[PDB]
């Protein structure tokens, strides 16, 4: 169902075509010229053949019609080559423009919205589904213009010569869709009966191929071969009932293609003998008129035959449009961008009043947040999972929009220009990524032109140089799941080295040295505890011990900072921090 939706998707497809309307017009125009040259080359053969067969004109006297016939063939090949290129350039132009709009939306939304879906899900929308629209604009749209302009030209061209030959071709014009509809009625019932099972059998091979580990640990590998064998005979038997009615509908066009050529031959052949005396205009029927109709009889149905082979390109573009439309119409409130610039590189002062951290979809992630972190002072956020600690850090990063007030040195964060604000910002978060190609390009992500001495001092400080020999190519070894996998603690020291390379104003540590082994946790917290004293710092940790030195502790519960104070004061005084500190730890 949802026809009102499928009509809106096709409505969306034609909106994107305005990007290259110029090339859709040329293809539309070149398909009219392509049908003029089909008639011209059928007219020159019809006139040449009449002279040789009936008038016995020698070929040497027919040089002028031959020359125009060769030219019409050369021109007809040029238009075919030109239409393929114009059609591709049209379709590629939508894909380039749309992919830029998709990535602009993803960059504008930022990591807050990207992290909702897997990166594989985003790759499908950008690569697979944007490419699925190409054949709609490259092949289907030009062909539908060709499927109407060409067959109407043959009918118009044959009609002056003979109105019965043109009526044979035009007679099939309303009969083909009428019979396809009748077959589509029968094919609909068979399609609906086999739809549930075929879609169920479609993913059978991939589901036995995924979870092939489970078939191994249970010794069911051989018993699943008979399962794949049985699901392949069931799929075939169901999909041939669909095809028995689909190739019948596809053969309606091929039935009238031959019935037209058979009738053109029989009518003209009997007209020349005197059996029939009705079709012509009582001027007599010539051999050229029969050749013109016979050469153009298969060309009448060729545009409609190609449209059948390009019709799949419309269904796969509507599905692509379906998902690409929802992506581009989501409300998606995003953080506000200003143009103010921070005055100095000195540590900043953070202060909030009735702050409300808002998700891209508008949901509040942290309730009214009231706090004040003086310049150069390090704070720590503690709380149970889901409290909203990372949401506060993300808002300071500019990744989330806030309703209340959040001032950096008295300047609102929304006023601050993101490009200049992130220059005063550094961070080490949970599940940190290494986007760059190599281990060197990751540490130097903040400043790629830093010299060897600057780079060596950064690796040594973060204790990256101690595990470098274990890697094959030293600093230059590519890092990733596909190349030289790093341990969780080794990749965390690369994130620490990257964050400490540049002097910052505010450093945001989100669960650093969590899920690290003992040695890396000591080394990560060695470098980060030293770096939290050079600027204002905000750390999020589930480890409540050894917080005595930190200037202030904030305890968050359900998006609310409920208890603020030093470690010494909060420990003795009963409260939410005392409960957290005495609470049993569920997992490592």
């Amino acid at each position: 169902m949802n026809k009102s939706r499928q009509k809106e998707l096709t409505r969306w497809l034609k909106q994107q075509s305005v990007i290259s309307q110029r090339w859709l017009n040329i293809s539309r125009l070149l398909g009219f010229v392509s049908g003029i040259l089909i008639i011209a080359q059928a007219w020159f053969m019809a006139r040449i053949l009449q002279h040789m067969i009936m008038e016995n004109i020698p070929r040497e006297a027919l040089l002028l019609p031959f020359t125009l016939l060769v030219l019409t063939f050369v021109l007809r090949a040029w238009v075919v080559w030109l239409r393929e290129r114009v059609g591709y350039h049209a379709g590629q132009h939508i894909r380039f423009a749309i992919r830029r709009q998709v990535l602009d939306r993803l960059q504008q939304a930022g990591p807050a919205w990207i992290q909702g879906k897997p990166a594989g899900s985003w790759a499908t929308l950008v690569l697979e589904q944007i490419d699925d629209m190409h054949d709609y604009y490259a092949r289907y749209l030009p062909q539908m213009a060709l499927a109407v302009s060409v067959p109407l030209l043959i009918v118009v061209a044959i009609f002056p010569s003979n109105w019965a030959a043109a009526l044979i071709l035009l007679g099939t014009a309303p009969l083909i869709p009428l019979f396809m509809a009748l077959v589509g009625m029968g094919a609909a019932d068979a399609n609906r009966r086999n739809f549930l099972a075929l879609a169920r059998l479609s993913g059978h091979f991939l589901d036995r191929l995924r979870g092939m580990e489970t078939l191994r640990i249970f010794g069911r590998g051989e018993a699943e071969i008979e399962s794949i064998r049985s699901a392949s005979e069931d799929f075939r038997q169901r999909t041939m009932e669909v095809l028995r009615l689909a190739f019948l509908s596809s053969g309606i066009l091929e039935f009238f293609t031959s019935l037209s050529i058979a009738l053109v031959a029989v009518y003209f052949g009997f007209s020349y003998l005197g059996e029939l005396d009705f079709g012509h205009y009582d001027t007599g029927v010539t051999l050229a008129a029969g050749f013109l109709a016979l050469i153009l009889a298969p060309e009448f149905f060729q545009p409609l035959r190609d449209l059948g082979t390009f019709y799949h390109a419309k269904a796969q573009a509507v599905g692509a449009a379906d998902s690409l439309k929802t992506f581009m119409e989501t409300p998606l409130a995003h953080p506000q961008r200003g143009e103010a610039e921070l005055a100095s590189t000195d540590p900043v002062t953070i202060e909030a009043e009735e702050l409300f951290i808002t998700s891209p979809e508008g949901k509040t992630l942290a309730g009214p947040l009231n706090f004040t972190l003086p310049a150069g002072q390090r704070a720590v956020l503690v709380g149970r999972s889901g409290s909203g600690k990372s949401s506060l850090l993300n808002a300071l990063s500019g990744f989330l929009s806030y309703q209340g007030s959040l001032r950096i040195n008295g300047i609102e964060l929304r006023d601050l220009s993101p490009e200049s604000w992130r220059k005063h910002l550094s961070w080490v978060g949970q599940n940190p990524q290494l986007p760059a190609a190599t281990l060197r390009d990751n540490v130097l992500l903040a400043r790629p032109d830093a010299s060897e001495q600057e780079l060596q001092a950064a690796l040594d400080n973060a204790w990256v140089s101690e595990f470098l020999p274990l890697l094959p190519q030293g600093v230059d070894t590519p890092v990733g799941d596909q190349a030289a996998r790093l341990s969780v603690g080794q990749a965390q020291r690369v994130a620490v080295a990257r964050a400490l390379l540049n002097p910052c104003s505010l450093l945001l540590l989100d669960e650093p040295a969590a899920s690290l082994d003992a040695h890396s946790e000591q080394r990560v917290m060695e470098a980060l505890n030293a770096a939290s004293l050079r600027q204002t710092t905000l750390m999020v940790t589930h480890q409540l011990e050894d917080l005595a030195d930190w200037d202030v502790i904030w305890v968050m519960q359900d998006g609310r900072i409920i208890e603020q104070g030093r470690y010494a004061e909060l420990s003795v005084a009963g409260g939410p921090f005392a409960t957290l500190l005495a609470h049993r730890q569920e997992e490592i």
Binding site: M45, L49, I53, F66, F73, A77, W78, E84, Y88, R99, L103, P111, I114, A119, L196, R200, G203, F205, L209, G211, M212, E213, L215, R216, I217, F218, G219, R220, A223, E224, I225, R229, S232, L243, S250, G251, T257, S258, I261, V266, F268, G269, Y272, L273, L287, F291, L294, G398, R422, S426, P432, L434, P435, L471, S515, H519, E545, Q585, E586, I588
Partner: protein, 573 residues
């Protein structure tokens, strides 16, 4: 084209069905040529005869010919698509049983170097591409070659110099144009696959690391690099469409040259006589109609390049040697299993860092051990050694004081029952999602286990016939976890390996699942791997792992009594 041989032996089966589909492609395509050739000659013969000579001219035979040739190209085309597609689905069964059979012996280890998310999607696509070799390459190419020969032989009766100058032109462009275009598009097709997966690799890095790039001022720099790959990628797509344009324009120019030559050469004379008359149109309309045979040949170079790429890609995946090999000793499954490890060391095939570093532990019969470690400590790599997914490089593993490498795969799978960290819910019914654990269990045996592990809502309103999977009912993480434990209960193996069984669960169901562990498999050697601390007092000999080696080992009381990582874990120091 040497890579197609392993998969062309799968086409050997159902050849009489593949050959019938090609035969119907000749008959359909000769009727198309015959209908236009006879019609062109019938028009010329009737016009030359004229009204004077109506009775002399035999017009019922050609009129019966055009009627017969019209029926046998619509019926012929219908059965050509039916037999061709039926024979294609028969082979697809062979291509998927073959692919699955070669991927089982190397399922955990042969596929580990890749991203299983987008590798198995590629394996399914490559099997489909290999399945369309006959439809897209063999049938259009073999079908056109036989049609050209029949036309050339048929026209040779009328004139030898005209039959071989039309058949020769058609046979030249069948035999040297596809090789020339495949050769020209070989580099672009490879550049196009390299640049597509490079763009995907660069886009995933740019999207996953968007928080790192945005704050360290690299997001614009890394998007220009991403958009430069797209420009190269689109340039390769344009060069691939220039060959599609050039191949269609050359087929049109060759088919034009055949028409021109027939008009010029057959005008001089067809056979012995000059002024051939009607026979001029028989050759012109044969050249005009016989290039429908070569129309599917035009794109066959593009399809053949894809199938060869898929054949190489599948072959490189299924032809690697299995990591582990099982002796066919045919031993009996032991009633009680005691597990022993000594200096087990393991490094992954390409990594230069050890995943397990001298792990040696002992698990006695009927003993419940719990391996306790952080993320990435190598505890899932330890259980994969017990299921023999890999082989330790410098250690020994013993089941009941006998090496684990001396057990036949059928005995190994019956000795060890493992609940994986990632539970797989197969597309089949709830009954078939449990019968893999124990095929012979009755429908009442499956019903009580579901009621014994707390899955009683699954038996509602459909029973065991509920379809769970891609199109069916999905199971929640806690409801999926009890199914993994339900499978282990049905297997009834002496040794049970649970990888993070209570992982991502609320404390209400975590406690009862862990309670379910202790009461059910109480007489079984249980080795649980987990990063949580709940219910560890029940287990004896808690083992703490860190960075691939054991750092602390003892029961719940002793580990707390002496200050250590477990005491730090509990305290949260």
């Amino acid at each position: 084209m040497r890579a197609l041989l392993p998969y062309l032996a799968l086409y050997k089966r159902h050849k009489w069905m593949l050959s019938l589909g090609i035969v119907l492609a000749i008959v359909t395509l000769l009727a198309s040529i015959g209908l236009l050739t006879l019609s062109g000659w019938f028009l010329s013969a009737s016009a030359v005869a004229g009204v004077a000579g109506l009775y002399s001219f035999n017009y019922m035979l050609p009129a019966a010919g055009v009627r017969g040739a019209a029926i046998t190209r619509t019926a012929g085309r219908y059965f050509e698509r039916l037999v061709s597609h039926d024979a294609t689905f028969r082979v697809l069964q062979h291509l998927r049983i073959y692919t699955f059979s070669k991927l089982l012996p190397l399922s955990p280890a042969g596929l580990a170097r890749y991203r299983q998310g987008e590798l198995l999607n590629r394996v399914v696509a490559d099997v489909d591409t290999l399945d369309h070799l006959y439809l897209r390459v063999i049938s259009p190419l073999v079908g056109a070659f036989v049609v050209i020969m029949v036309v050339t032989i048929g026209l040779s009766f009328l004139d030898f110099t005209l039959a071989f100058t039309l058949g020769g032109i058609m046979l030249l462009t069948l035999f040297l144009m596809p090789p020339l275009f495949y050769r020209a598009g070989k580099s672009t097709g490879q550049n196009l696959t390299h640049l597509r997966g490079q763009y995907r690799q660069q886009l995933t890095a740019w999207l996953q690391g968007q928080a790192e790039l945005t704050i360290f001022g690299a997001s614009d720099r890394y998007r220009t690099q991403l958009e430069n790959t797209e420009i190269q990628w689109l340039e390769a797509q344009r060069r691939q469409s220039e060959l599609t344009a050039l191949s269609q324009a050359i087929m049109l120019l060759i088919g034009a040259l055949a028409v021109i030559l027939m008009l010029w050469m057959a005008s001089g004379g067809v056979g012995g006589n000059a002024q051939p008359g009607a026979l001029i149109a028989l050759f012109v309309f044969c050249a005009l109609a016989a290039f429908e045979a070569l129309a599917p040949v035009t794109g066959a170079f593009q399809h053949l390049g894809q199938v060869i790429a898929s054949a190489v890609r599948i072959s490189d995946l299924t032809d690697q040697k299995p990591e582990v090999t099982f002796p066919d000793t045919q031993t009996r499954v032991a009633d009680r299993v005691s597990l022993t490890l000594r200096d087990v060391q393991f490094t992954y095939p390409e990594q230069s860092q050890q995943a397990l570093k001298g792990i040696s532990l002992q698990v006695n019969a009927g003993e419940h051990i719990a391996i306790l470690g952080r993320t990435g400590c190598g505890k899932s790599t330890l259980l994969q050694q017990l299921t023999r997914a890999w082989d330790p490089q410098q250690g020994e593993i013993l089941l009941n004081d006998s090496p684990i490498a001396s057990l036949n795969e059928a005995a190994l799978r019956q000795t060890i029952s493992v609940v994986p960290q990632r539970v797989h819910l197969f597309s089949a019914t709830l009954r078939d999602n449990l019968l893999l654990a124990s095929p012979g269990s009755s429908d009442e045996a499956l019903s009580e286990i579901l009621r014994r592990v707390g899955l009683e809502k699954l038996l509602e309103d459909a029973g065991l016939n509920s379809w769970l999977g891609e199109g069916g009912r999905q199971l929640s993480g806690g409801e999926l976890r009890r199914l993994a434990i339900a499978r282990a209960l049905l297997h009834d193996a002496p040794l049970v390996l649970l990888d993070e069984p209570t992982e991502g669960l609320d404390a209400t169901t975590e406690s009862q699942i862990l309670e379910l562990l202790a009461e059910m498999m109480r007489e079984k050697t249980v080795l649980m791997v987990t990063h949580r601390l709940r219910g560890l007092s029940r287990f004896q000999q808690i083992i703490v792992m860190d960075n691939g080696q054991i750092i602390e080992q003892g029961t719940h009381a002793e580990l707390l009594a002496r200050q250590g990582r477990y005491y730090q874990f509990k305290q949260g120091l």
